[PDB]
Ligand binder design. Structure first.
Ligand SMILES: *[C@@H]1O[C@H](CO)[C@@H](O[C@@H]2O[C@H](CO)[C@@H](O)[C@H](O)[C@H]2NC(C)=O)[C@H](O)[C@H]1NC(C)=O
Ligand SMILES: *[C@@H]1O[C@H](CO)[C@@H](O[C@@H]2O[C@H](CO)[C@@H](O)[C@H](O)[C@H]2NC(C)=O)[C@H](O)[C@H]1NC(C)=O
Ligand SMILES: *[C@@H]1O[C@H](CO)[C@@H](O[C@@H]2O[C@H](CO)[C@@H](O)[C@H](O)[C@H]2NC(C)=O)[C@H](O)[C@H]1NC(C)=O
Ligand SMILES: *[C@@H]1O[C@H](CO)[C@@H](O[C@@H]2O[C@H](CO)[C@@H](O)[C@H](O)[C@H]2NC(C)=O)[C@H](O)[C@H]1NC(C)=O
Ligand SMILES: *[C@@H]1O[C@H](CO)[C@@H](O)[C@H](O)[C@H]1NC(C)=O
Ligand SMILES: *[C@@H]1O[C@H](CO)[C@@H](O)[C@H](O)[C@H]1NC(C)=O
Ligand SMILES: *[C@@H]1O[C@H](CO)[C@@H](O)[C@H](O)[C@H]1NC(C)=O
Ligand SMILES: *[C@@H]1O[C@H](CO)[C@@H](O)[C@H](O)[C@H]1NC(C)=O
Ligand SMILES: *[C@@H]1O[C@H](CO)[C@@H](O)[C@H](O)[C@H]1NC(C)=O
Ligand SMILES: *[C@@H]1O[C@H](CO)[C@@H](O)[C@H](O)[C@H]1NC(C)=O
Ligand SMILES: *[C@@H]1O[C@H](CO)[C@@H](O)[C@H](O)[C@H]1NC(C)=O
Ligand SMILES: *[C@@H]1O[C@H](CO)[C@@H](O)[C@H](O)[C@H]1NC(C)=O
Lengths: 317, 122, 389, 49
């Protein structure tokens, strides 16, 4: 916000009065710029986990697993995944207000996510530690199975089944995202609470705060100097209060988003670059792996987890 | 708590790479952690198999990976190349070997048979 | 720009970075004023010169519409003992342009001229003629010995000393509650007759008709100017509008309660107001300890307004655009970053996400490390801050 | 909190003056209601495991 442009029009008479209130109209700018750069830092921390831009091999014989849904489409302008294209569709000035574009454009985020996903697919957790070390995907899944305490043979003897279930589950998610938009609510609210705040701030320019008129140009065109400043300062006070309330709300909300981004970065590190032994930290059931996906101002993790089923009693000692 | 008073299994929590240990240091209004981490380096390719069919039975490694240096097969731990001979005690068995895709024919050495032969000689 | 940042930081050394330091804003080039080109002159000169004024008993009311006024000649005249305005300045009255004016005429005691101000209290206010709190106008009064005072007492003039209820503002009504003044030229000024005229304007919420002497001027379009339509005054760029105003509408009001469209008062034409271009100005600078070079980013406005390079973040000036990516130094926005490099220049470029690589994946090949390195990594975390009180 | 009940008593005179301060009451009430539902979310995410 150009707080001078918000509080006062393009008028010097009001600017001079605003000036003798001190550094408020620079403290607000400082705070807002801090928030703006913190958003860039959040996105960087979440997605800059990978040192290099890995990419998939041309041939996709990943032991029967079918990642074509989450890997980038080679033919698309922006190299986004098919699922990422669902998310980017299910989420939807004149007073000194302005929106700076994010440093990393959405295709840059898509590049980061595709690099992470390709690294995970072709080298498991090894690229998370140091340089990527290729491994057949079947063996990677075998060792994750071993990690969750199941003898790796169980995978190999059931590979064709375990692939299908996986290929089945990745279908289900599509049905969930394409049909119901409500899934993205978590992001949408964050957008709404921002827009709703903005819509309020501008609306406060339409109020008197006790002056004779909300529009400042009319006050100037009616009252001369001494009896005009008495009214202009009322608008100065009211609009400073409104802008300070907005900035305080934005600071608190940005702190909340900072916490959320820190959680997201931790989840990326501990579930995409490795395997989490922390229960319920990445999906219900025993964690096998995770796949990141970009979304407008957010990240979607697909947690592939192992759930026991069809249990039998036995007597034990 | 997790990096200094212990060893963290959480990846990238106590520094890049596998966490070995950590050391705290004071600083004006802050703390500096020195994360000692283990980073693999100087890697080599190897052909590999998920299991081995020896007697018609599928053999799997108890730890590590089956890796071939081009003409011979060994079993080596996951994170450091140390080729060991494929023994009946480096591995375990599960049923017939037609059920696994990508299995490779090879022999698995058994330490008892040499003793059997030695006793038969004596 | 570099010194602008230096002041903004209150420092003589500016560390490498991007600093917001000012606001680009286009000044208007000329002033345009439009008014309904009526030729009639207002009849004010008559209300101040009537033979016989009314009395608050039946205070007289006159209405003014469809005429051009000049209040300077009235304000500067010598006969007027008191001329005080509320909600508008006496000198400004030539700048505004109203929908209607109400002139109320009466006579009153000189002591009672203190009792006519808006929201004031007293018998002449609550029992004869009450001005409301929302009053916007001018109260005018002057002593009237030679007009309304005569030998034997000018009994023609009446007022109410009692009423069963206080008046609503601008109300008129017709022991005994009425009494006449003793206007004799012999009597003291406090009791001498004062002629009082109250002008209440109606500020424009509709086509203005009683309107100032300012000369109308031919307008221009697509250029930032100062505009004034019937007193609605501001700054912006005018353009032809595609909005379909209904015939009774004068201006379109935006979400921020600002007029984004106005009808030309002297034509059926409908014009759209756009706040002419503005934006933030940031300074991309390397450390002053390295170089005094600098580049400027005008945010949200492209370069036809202000080498030069257009970006999704804005118009960048000074920096040189080069297509080969780097781990980007100074973040400009939308993938563009700037840096200082050796000619010595500020380059701007699309950032590099990282080294491009592909893993040698195959369905039977695995890579294993043969060696290792022990790495010590620093991690600094703030634990507390100064305990200020 | 109902600020119109807190800032102003039962009088309409105070209510009308408060009204021309804009949506300050709406903002405060909205924030407090957000906190209120946030508490329910907090308890749910802890015990609805
Ligand atoms: C991976 O799954 C996708 C669908 O998720 C498969 O794509 C289908 O391929 C058939 C055959 O060409 C088409 O008729 C369908 O229209 C495709 N569906 C979609 C949604 O694209 C793909 O064949 C699978 N690949 C493998 C190797 O299993
Ligand atoms: C794979 O490893 C085996 C075991 O070391 C290699 O065979 C040995 O080769 C050396 C000469 O380099 C001989 O002195 C040994 O007698 C061999 N041992 C056996 C058991 O054959 C083999 O050459 C290696 N192959 C490759 C391609 O590296
Ligand atoms: C591993 O070796 C066995 C023999 O020791 C192979 O089994 C033979 O396979 C052929 C072709 O399928 C059959 O005609 C024979 O009847 C099989 N014999 C036995 C005893 O099973 C097997 O194909 C080899 N596998 C690999 C991967 O080399
Ligand atoms: C594993 O790596 C270490 C170094 O990280 C190697 O040791 C180096 O050997 C060269 C031989 O010329 C010396 O010049 C260096 O000074 C050694 N470094 C250290 C830290 O001692 C070691 O040889 C490697 N091992 C293998 C099997 O390749
Ligand atoms: C096996 O477990 C189920 C659990 O619901 C129980 O109902 C059933 O009685 C058990 N079987 C026997 C033989 O008790
Ligand atoms: C070994 O791996 C490298 C990649 O690190 C690859 O370029 C090379 O072709 C591989 N060797 C063989 C024999 O395929
Ligand atoms: C590996 O890929 C090759 C490609 O030609 C194929 O012939 C072979 O059957 C595959 N084997 C496994 C185990 O995936
Ligand atoms: C009408 O009244 C004004 C104001 O007192 C005065 O200046 C003017 O002379 C009067 N008109 C005539 C014809 O005297
Ligand atoms: C007032 O302006 C109109 C243009 O809309 C013009 O036609 C008219 O002649 C003007 N008035 C007079 C008295 O000429
Ligand atoms: C930075 O400032 C120091 C102290 O003035 C100076 O010694 C140094 O040369 C400067 N850096 C460069 C690159 O000139
Ligand atoms: C500003 O940019 C838009 C879109 O890039 C372009 O259409 C417009 O012409 C530019 N400004 C001017 C004054 O042309
Ligand atoms: C940058 O792009 C232009 C065309 O857009 C091309 O002619 C030029 O060669 C590119 N830069 C370099 C260093 O080649």
């Amino acid at each position: 916000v150009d707080c001078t442009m918000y509080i006062c029009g393009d008028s010097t008479e009001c600017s001079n009065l605003l000036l003798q209130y001190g550094s408020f109209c620079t403290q607000l700018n400082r705070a807002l710029t801090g928030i703006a750069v913190e958003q860039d830092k959040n996105t960087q921390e979440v997605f800059a986990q990978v040192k290099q831009i890995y990419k998939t091999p041309p041939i996709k014989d990943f032991g029967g697993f079918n990642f074509s849904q989450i890997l980038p489409d080679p033919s698309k302008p922006s190299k986004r995944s098919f699922i990422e294209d669902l998310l980017f569709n299910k989420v939807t000035k004149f007073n000194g207000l302005t929106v700076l574009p994010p440093l990393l454009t959405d295709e840059m985020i898509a590049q980061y996510t595709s690099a992470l996903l390709a690294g995970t697919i072709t080298s498991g957790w090894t690229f998370g530690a140091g340089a990527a070390l290729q491994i057949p995907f079947a063996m990677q899944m075998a060792y994750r199975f071993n990690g969750i305490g199941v003898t790796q043979n169980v995978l190999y003897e059931n590979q064709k089944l375990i692939a299908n279930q996986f290929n089945s589950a990745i279908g289900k998610i599509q049905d969930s995202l394409s049909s119901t938009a409500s899934a993205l609510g978590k992001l949408q609210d964050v957008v709404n609470q921002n827009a709703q705040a903005l819509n309020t701030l501008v609306k406060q320019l339409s109020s008197n705060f006790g002056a004779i008129s909300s529009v400042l140009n009319d006050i100037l065109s009616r009252l001369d100097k001494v009896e005009a400043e008495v009214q202009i300062d009322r608008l100065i006070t009211g609009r400073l209060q409104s802008l300070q309330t907005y900035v305080t709300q934005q600071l608190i909300r940005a702190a909340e988003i900072r916490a959320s981004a820190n959680l997201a970065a931790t989840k990326m590190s501990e579930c995409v670059l490795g395997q989490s032994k922390r229960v319920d930290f990445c999906g219900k059931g025993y964690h096998l792996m995770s796949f990141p996906q970009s979304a407008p101002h957010g990240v979607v993790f697909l947690h592939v987890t192992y759930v026991p089923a069809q249990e039998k009693n036995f007597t034990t000692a | 708590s997790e990096c200094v008073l212990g060893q963290s299994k959480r990846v990238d929590f106590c520094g890049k790479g596998y966490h070995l240990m950590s050391f705290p240091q004071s600083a004006p209004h802050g703390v500096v952690f020195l994360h000692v981490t283990y980073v693999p380096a100087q890697e080599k390719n190897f052909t590999t198999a998920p299991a081995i069919c020896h007697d018609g039975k599928a053999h799997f490694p108890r730890e590590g990976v089956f890796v071939s240096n081009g003409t011979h097969w060994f079993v080596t731990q996951r994170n450091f190349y140390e080729p060991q001979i494929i023994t009946t005690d480096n591995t375990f068995v599960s049923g017939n070997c037609d059920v696994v895709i990508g299995i490779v024919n090879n022999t698995v050495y058994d330490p008892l048979q040499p003793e059997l032969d030695s006793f038969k000689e004596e | 720009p570099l010194s602008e940042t230096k002041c903004t930081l209150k420092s003589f050394t500016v560390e490498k970075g991007i600093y917001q330091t000012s606001n680009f804003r286009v000044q208007p080039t000329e002033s345009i004023v439009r008014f309904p080109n009526i030729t009639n002159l207002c009849p004010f000169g008559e209300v101040f010169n009537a033979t016989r004024f009314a009395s608050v008993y039946a205070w007289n009311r006159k209405r003014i519409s469809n005429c051009v006024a000049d209040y300077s000649v009235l304000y500067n005249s010598a006969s007027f003992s008191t001329f005080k305005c509320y909600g508008v300045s006496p000198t400004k009255l030539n700048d505004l342009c109203f929908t209607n004016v109400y002139a109320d005429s009466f006579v009153i005691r000189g002591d009672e001229v203190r009792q006519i101000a808006p929201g004031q209290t007293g018998k002449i206010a609550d029992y004869n003629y009450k001005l409301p709190d929302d009053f916007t106008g001018c109260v005018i009064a002057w002593n009237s010995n030679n007009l309304d005072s005569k030998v034997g007492g000018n009994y023609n003039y009446l007022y109410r000393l009692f009423r069963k209820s206080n008046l609503k503002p601008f109300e008129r009504d017709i022991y005994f509650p009425l009494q006449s003044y003793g206007f004799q030229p012999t009597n003291g000024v406090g009791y001498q007759p004062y002629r009082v005229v109250v002008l209440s304007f109606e500020l424009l919420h509709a086509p203005a008709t009683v309107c100032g002497p300012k000369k109308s001027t031919n307008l221009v379009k697509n250029k930032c100017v100062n505009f004034n339509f019937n007193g609605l005054t501001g700054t912006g760029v005018l353009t032809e509008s595609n909005k379909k105003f209904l015939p009774f509408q004068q201006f379109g009001r935006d979400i921020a309660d600002t007029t984004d469209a106005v009808r030309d008062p002297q034509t059926l034409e409908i014009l759209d107001i756009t706040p002419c271009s503005f934006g933030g100005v940031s300074v991309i600078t390397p450390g002053t300890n390295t170089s005094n070079q600098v580049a400027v980013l005008y945010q949200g406005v492209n370069c036809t307004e202000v080498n030069v390079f257009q970006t999704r973040a804005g118009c960048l000036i000074g920096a040189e655009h080069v297509n080969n990516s780097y781990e980007c130094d100074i973040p400009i926005g939308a993938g563009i970053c700037a840096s200082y490099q050796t000619s010595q220049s500020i380059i701007a470029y699309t950032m590099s996400l990282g080294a491009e690589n592909s893993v040698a994946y195959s369905n039977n090949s695995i890579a294993i490390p043969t060696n290792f390195t022990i790495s010590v990594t620093t991690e600094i975390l703030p634990v507390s801050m100064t305990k200020t009180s």
